[PDB]
Design a binder for this molecule. Sequence first.
Ligand SMILES: *[C@@H]1O[C@H](CO)[C@@H](O[C@@H]2O[C@H](CO)[C@@H](O[C@@H]3O[C@H](CO[C@H]4O[C@H](CO[C@H]5O[C@H](CO)[C@@H](O)[C@H](O)[C@@H]5O)[C@@H](O)[C@H](O[C@H]5O[C@H](CO)[C@@H](O)[C@H](O)[C@@H]5O)[C@@H]4O)[C@@H](O)[C@H](O[C@H]4O[C@H](CO)[C@@H](O)[C@H](O)[C@@H]4O)[C@@H]3O)[C@H](O)[C@H]2NC(C)=O)[C@H](O)[C@H]1NC(C)=O
Ligand SMILES: *[C@@H]1O[C@H](CO)[C@@H](O[C@@H]2O[C@H](CO)[C@@H](O[C@@H]3O[C@H](CO[C@H]4O[C@H](CO[C@H]5O[C@H](CO)[C@@H](O)[C@H](O)[C@@H]5O)[C@@H](O)[C@H](O[C@H]5O[C@H](CO)[C@@H](O)[C@H](O)[C@@H]5O)[C@@H]4O)[C@@H](O)[C@H](O[C@H]4O[C@H](CO)[C@@H](O)[C@H](O)[C@@H]4O)[C@@H]3O)[C@H](O)[C@H]2NC(C)=O)[C@H](O)[C@H]1NC(C)=O
Ligand SMILES: *[C@@H]1O[C@H](CO)[C@@H](O[C@@H]2O[C@H](CO)[C@@H](O)[C@H](O)[C@H]2NC(C)=O)[C@H](O)[C@H]1NC(C)=O
Ligand SMILES: *[C@@H]1O[C@H](CO)[C@@H](O)[C@H](O)[C@H]1NC(C)=O
Ligand SMILES: *[C@@H]1O[C@H](CO)[C@@H](O)[C@H](O)[C@H]1NC(C)=O
Ligand SMILES: *[C@H]1O[C@H](CO)[C@@H](O)[C@H](O)[C@H]1NC(C)=O
Ligand SMILES: *[C@H]1O[C@H](CO)[C@@H](O)[C@H](O)[C@H]1NC(C)=O
Lengths: 338, 271, 136
Amino acid sequence: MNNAGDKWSAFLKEQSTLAQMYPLQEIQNLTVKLQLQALQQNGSSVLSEDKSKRLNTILNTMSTIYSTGKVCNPDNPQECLLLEPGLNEIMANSLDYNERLWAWESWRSEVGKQLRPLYEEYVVLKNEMARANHYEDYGDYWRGDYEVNGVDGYDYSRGQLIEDVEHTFEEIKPLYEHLHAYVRAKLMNAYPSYISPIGCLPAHLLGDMWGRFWTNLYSLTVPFGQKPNIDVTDAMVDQAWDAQRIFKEAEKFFVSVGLPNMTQGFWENSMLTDPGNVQKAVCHPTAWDLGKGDFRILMCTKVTMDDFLTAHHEMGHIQYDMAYAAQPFLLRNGANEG
Amino acid sequence: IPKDQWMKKWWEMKREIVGVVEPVPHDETYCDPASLFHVSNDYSFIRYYTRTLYQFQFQEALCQAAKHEGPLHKCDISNSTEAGQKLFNMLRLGKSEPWTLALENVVGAKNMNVRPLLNYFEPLFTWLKDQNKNSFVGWSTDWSPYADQSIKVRISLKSALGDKAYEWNDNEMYLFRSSVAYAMRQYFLKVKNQMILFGEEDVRVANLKPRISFNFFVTAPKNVSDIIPRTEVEKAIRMSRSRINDAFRLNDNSLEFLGIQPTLGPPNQPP
Amino acid sequence: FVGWSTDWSPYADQSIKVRISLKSALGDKAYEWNDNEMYLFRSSVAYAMRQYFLKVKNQMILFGEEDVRVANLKPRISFNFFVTAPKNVSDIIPRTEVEKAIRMSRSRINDAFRLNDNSLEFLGIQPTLGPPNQPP
Ligand SMILES: *[C@@H]1O[C@H](CO)[C@@H](O[C@@H]2O[C@H](CO)[C@@H](O[C@@H]3O[C@H](CO[C@H]4O[C@H](CO[C@H]5O[C@H](CO)[C@@H](O)[C@H](O)[C@@H]5O)[C@@H](O)[C@H](O[C@H]5O[C@H](CO)[C@@H](O)[C@H](O)[C@@H]5O)[C@@H]4O)[C@@H](O)[C@H](O[C@H]4O[C@H](CO)[C@@H](O)[C@H](O)[C@@H]4O)[C@@H]3O)[C@H](O)[C@H]2NC(C)=O)[C@H](O)[C@H]1NC(C)=O
Ligand SMILES: *[C@@H]1O[C@H](CO)[C@@H](O[C@@H]2O[C@H](CO)[C@@H](O[C@@H]3O[C@H](CO[C@H]4O[C@H](CO[C@H]5O[C@H](CO)[C@@H](O)[C@H](O)[C@@H]5O)[C@@H](O)[C@H](O[C@H]5O[C@H](CO)[C@@H](O)[C@H](O)[C@@H]5O)[C@@H]4O)[C@@H](O)[C@H](O[C@H]4O[C@H](CO)[C@@H](O)[C@H](O)[C@@H]4O)[C@@H]3O)[C@H](O)[C@H]2NC(C)=O)[C@H](O)[C@H]1NC(C)=O
Ligand SMILES: *[C@@H]1O[C@H](CO)[C@@H](O[C@@H]2O[C@H](CO)[C@@H](O)[C@H](O)[C@H]2NC(C)=O)[C@H](O)[C@H]1NC(C)=O
Ligand SMILES: *[C@@H]1O[C@H](CO)[C@@H](O)[C@H](O)[C@H]1NC(C)=O
Ligand SMILES: *[C@@H]1O[C@H](CO)[C@@H](O)[C@H](O)[C@H]1NC(C)=O
Ligand SMILES: *[C@H]1O[C@H](CO)[C@@H](O)[C@H](O)[C@H]1NC(C)=O
Ligand SMILES: *[C@H]1O[C@H](CO)[C@@H](O)[C@H](O)[C@H]1NC(C)=O
């Protein structure tokens, strides 16, 4: 896989240099101009060899530091807790203020401090790379994925994204304020004398390590706990729902709205069931568009309602990938990243 | 944002946008946002914002072709071929056309709109508004869990000195922080028999006002996450308040610590 | 002269000597000159340097307690201090500017230790008593 990826990357890089022979100042075909834009972006090839290798080194170092980050007891350095196992459980299940504060502070002091000097250089290197490609800043290069030009009414500038996001967020704020107030009121009864009724929420009491999701706080903020949630996990077991028929149900749901059927080779090449311990495979549900009408799904599907919803989600990606199969390879992607 | 003002800005944005306050103070040596996976691995994060809107813009659109009558959260687009065709008209498009044109083929609009999300969550929004009649909605950017350990100082230069009074610039603040650090050192040396190397960077000051009234708290020498409890700070200030008063030519009334009240002294009596 | 002395240095011409007599100005109730008093004195000197560089040269220089280097501490409380660059120790502020800074803010330094111009001698900075104003 590394050899194949390196060959593909080398081919893409050498074709990027060849694409420079056709400037955008003379291209008049819309799809041709867009493909030229897609293949013309230098990316990290515009920096010097030393700067490029330093950027790759710091990126790899940051990734490794995040991956290997462990919180350890000074008394016994041998025993440590990793991020995914244990620490997430501590942040999502514990009802002790001191324990959650310790987990949050230890994670943000053991990984953040080691990442600050690297991130300082990463910012400068990314800014230099962006400026070498006629961009004001690297964030502008990020926002460039929504850039639309030369359509006479559909045009979208990179600086328009900031103002649009700012305008849209002010219309969510009225709902977010009430949701935050309710969450604070409900947490007042779980962590007394720590949640002020007049102030904000402490960062370590949001059910997750970073507060990106408040899902784990549901148990502490359920509106009516006496009424059970809609669960159909046991019903599927009673009807003996294996991980072969739920995909059929999802396919029927898709075809009910007019979307096409599944490919003949999709079911044969798929891995809708875990291969057990004999074969080592990944379990993150992913959709794969290999090409030449080859669409596949990787998923260690269990018997769960969440598995059913995830199967629907992955079939959505599969259908989207199948929809634009006739488009040129450079245009075989969504309208934007979202 | 200057390189030496990242965290102070970051926790200034969380306090007024997300409404989340850090439990313990963080200096510039921390990189809290880098603790997130998507920040330390160079992934654009705005994608997760727009995707949150688009789906609802899609869903609210697809329930119009499906002819949904009830609330949006009860809508089902199944068994509706028109909605499927409307979605497929954009799905087959791919990147060949601008994303605005793709949106106009489903939602009929060229720019992203947030109204579908509010329409989806309206049944919850009404209940939440009805559930917060007595509680206080919103948050304040001035409270923090460590604000209970802060000591407020109020200084009146032109009342104790009248004329010939110096101006309270940054140098006077440095001198005041050094005096506080010296007082902490004296308290920890003469009482607890612990040699702690405090400095002018370990007396953190906020909320400076033209009245010369701020809030300072003393942290650990190089462990900013650790804050000295307020009782020990008050004892240290009481122990060496005369030196602090002498350093600024104030006398116990133009330098008020708002919680440390001085003692005048017993009026000794004849037999 | 054969031999050498371990007390001379090319930068010793920029040093300012401070002599302090606690038990003469205060008699009793006099504090002891431990390391905390030295930290306070270095902070006062750094503050004086900041004030001089802000009110005269219009240059914002961030001095600290580590930029006032002190040597030759003795039980008399008589040492030699010199003020260096904020983070460029190889650079030493010339003695004339240090003396001007001390003259500018000597009252604050005296007040910080409850000394008055005679128990805090800078050995090179002599104070001025003040003109005896006369009737017509
Ligand atoms: C800079 O300063 C910061 C502080 O600002 C400092 O960080 C602290 O470091 C200490 C030392 O590591 C941390 O204390 C550790 O906590 C570990 C987590 O497990 C405990 O977490 C809670 C701690 O509460 C303690 O105190 C309360 C009140 O006195 C007491 O009730 C607790 O029992 C505990 O002693 C605690 O709530 C939690 O409770 C468990 O049990 C209850 C049931 O009772 C359950 O309901 C909970 O869900 C939870 O399971 C639990 O007890 C802990 O593992 C650790 O103990 C090990 O290490 C020490 C040595 O470190 C050994 O002596 C010990 O035998 C164990 O092997 C220790 O107690 C503290 O949490 C940090 N605080 C913060 C804010 O970070 C930094 O270290 C400083 N850095 C520098 C460089 O100076
Ligand atoms: C921390 O502080 C330290 C200081 O403590 C500081 O280090 C100093 O940095 C400066 C700037 O780089 C250095 O000055 C450089 O000197 C280079 C060496 O060549 C010269 O060296 C002697 C310098 O004397 C200067 O001043 C005298 C008196 O004013 C004057 O007469 C000289 O002409 C000169 O200006 C000098 O003796 C020497 O003389 C040559 O010529 C005579 C004949 O006249 C001959 O007999 C000698 O043999 C010799 O050949 C020579 O002139 C010099 O190259 C350099 O000049 C270049 O750089 C500057 C910019 O830096 C350009 O403006 C200039 O046009 C040249 O391109 C500059 O003059 C100084 O020596 C350092 N001192 C010490 C002690 O290190 C650190 O930088 C500080 N660090 C931080 C982070 O703040
Ligand atoms: C831009 O170029 C494309 C590619 O040539 C044109 O799309 C068609 O592509 C097929 C397959 O390559 C060709 O056989 C056709 O001749 C192309 N043209 C048509 C009209 O089908 C596309 O039309 C071009 N755009 C413009 C505006 O000319
Ligand atoms: C990419 O880099 C080349 C030189 O390496 C430069 O000529 C070109 O303008 C850059 N940009 C594009 C889009 O090719
Ligand atoms: C899809 O294929 C299955 C068998 O693979 C078939 O039973 C079903 O009828 C097909 N869908 C439609 C709409 O015909
Ligand atoms: C005031 O009283 C307190 C204790 O009651 C004492 O420590 C302090 O020195 C007194 N201050 C005077 C007498 O000036
Ligand atoms: C002493 O005289 C000098 C100048 O001669 C002056 O700056 C200083 O303020 C005087 N000190 C007094 C009058 O106390």
